[PDB]
Amino acid sequence: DLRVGRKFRIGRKIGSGSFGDIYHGTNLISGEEVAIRLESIRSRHPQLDYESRVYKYLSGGVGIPFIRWFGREGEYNAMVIDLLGPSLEDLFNYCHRKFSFKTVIMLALQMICRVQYIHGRSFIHRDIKPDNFLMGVGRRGSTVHVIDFGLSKKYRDFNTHRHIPYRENKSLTGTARYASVNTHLGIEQSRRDDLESLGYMLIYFCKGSLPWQGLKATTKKQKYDRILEKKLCISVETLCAGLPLEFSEYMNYCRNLKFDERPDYLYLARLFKDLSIKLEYHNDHLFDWTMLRYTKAMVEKKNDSFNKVKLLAMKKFASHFHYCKNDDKHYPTPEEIKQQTVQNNNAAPELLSAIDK
Numbered sequence: 001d002l003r004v005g006r007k008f009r010i011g012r013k014i015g016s017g018s019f020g021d022i023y024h025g026t027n028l029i030s031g032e033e034v035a036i037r038l039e040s041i042r043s044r045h046p047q048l049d050y051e052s053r054v055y056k057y058l059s060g061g062v063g064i065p066f067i068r069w070f071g072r073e074g075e076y077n078a079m080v081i082d083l084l085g086p087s088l089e090d091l092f093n094y095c096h097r098k099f100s101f102k103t104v105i106m107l108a109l110q111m112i113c114r115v116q117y118i119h120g121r122s123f124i125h126r127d128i129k130p131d132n133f134l135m136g137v138g139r140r141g142s143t144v145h146v147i148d149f150g151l152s153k154k155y156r157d158f159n160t161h162r163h164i165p166y167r168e169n170k171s172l173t174g175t176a177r178y179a180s181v182n183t184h185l186g187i188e189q190s191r192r193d194d195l196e197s198l199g200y201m202l203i204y205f206c207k208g209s210l211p212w213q214g215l216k217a218t219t220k221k222q223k224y225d226r227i228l229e230k231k232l233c234i235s236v237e238t239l240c241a242g243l244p245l246e247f248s249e250y251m252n253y254c255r256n257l258k259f260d261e262r263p264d265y266l267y268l269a270r271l272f273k274d275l276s277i278k279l280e281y282h283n284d285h286l287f288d289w290t291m292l293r294y295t296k297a298m299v300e301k302k303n304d305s306f307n308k309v310k311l312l313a314m315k316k317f318a319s320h321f322h323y324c325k326n327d328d329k330h331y332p333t334p335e336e337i338k339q340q341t342v343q344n345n346n347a348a349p350e351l352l353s354a355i356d357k
């Protein structure tokens, strides 16, 4: 309950982590709810100061949490920033670990823009994963935000745009579930790698998992290298089985980019915009969790309970909920996928009547 940056009061924890804790905070003058991150100054590997400085440099971008204050408060490095909502991994779990094509397409459109803005500010993220994308709170709940810039890096000179040099034998640090093949190989990360990681997330979201998940090994390196072998040896076709051709096209593009090459962000956005048209989706910010949450509220006026809610939701929103069929070996046609609209309507008392109201 101490004060930070004169006017920010620390409240309840949100909260804990490896680089410190994150708290609810309040601006004592305006009453605005914010987020406050703390890092012990006795930390052996300080990261908060770095992140705050990246956040400052990125300040003003759409979907970049807006830093309000950072500095020193006694025994703590502190950072005051926008309060955000659930992560996409959180929402993935809420939806029982599968997203519709529509929701994945809509996330992809926003996330490509976020990554584009970050690259436009001469930084690469280097830690692209579902946990690092959060929705806004309240009415900002339709905007995907990017967080966690502790591993981010300048990939080019601010004035000359001279790219950092090519390099090998770089070490790998985290879970490498979403890491690019070239990261695994020890190559200096560049813009392409952020986008490849984004690609794996999309496939993850669609299919419910990646085929190199849940591996065990005797050492970290062995595990990393087992993941690398699967990424390398499983074809893009197999990887993207059951998904419209855009998803494998997205992946082939990222894997084919050269080290210092500027990505064609608009080409990639057009992939998913064109697909949403073929699938007759509106870009209406109506995500799976939005509609499941609404449906549930009306019903209430645990695995088995969810399935009933989901059934009603898919009936009321038949044209919105299309899913990958993981037994598929091919890329389904748009008309193939849209056939699920009919199936959704054909599913089945007073409860079906209640929801319309």
Ligand SMILES: Nc1ncnc2c1ncn2[C@@H]1O[C@H](COP(=O)(O)OP(=O)(O)O)[C@@H](O)[C@H]1O
Pocket: 014, 015, 016, 017, 018, 019, 020, 021, 022, 035, 065, 081, 082, 083, 084, 085, 086, 087, 131, 134, 147
């Ligand atoms: N600006 C923010 N507003 C609200 N919640 C946040 C913000 N930044 C991170 N979080 C959330 O706080 C929780 C703890 O985050 P943190 O400890 O930094 O990550 P991790 O636990 O993965 O190391 C996470 O669930 C994360 O989604």
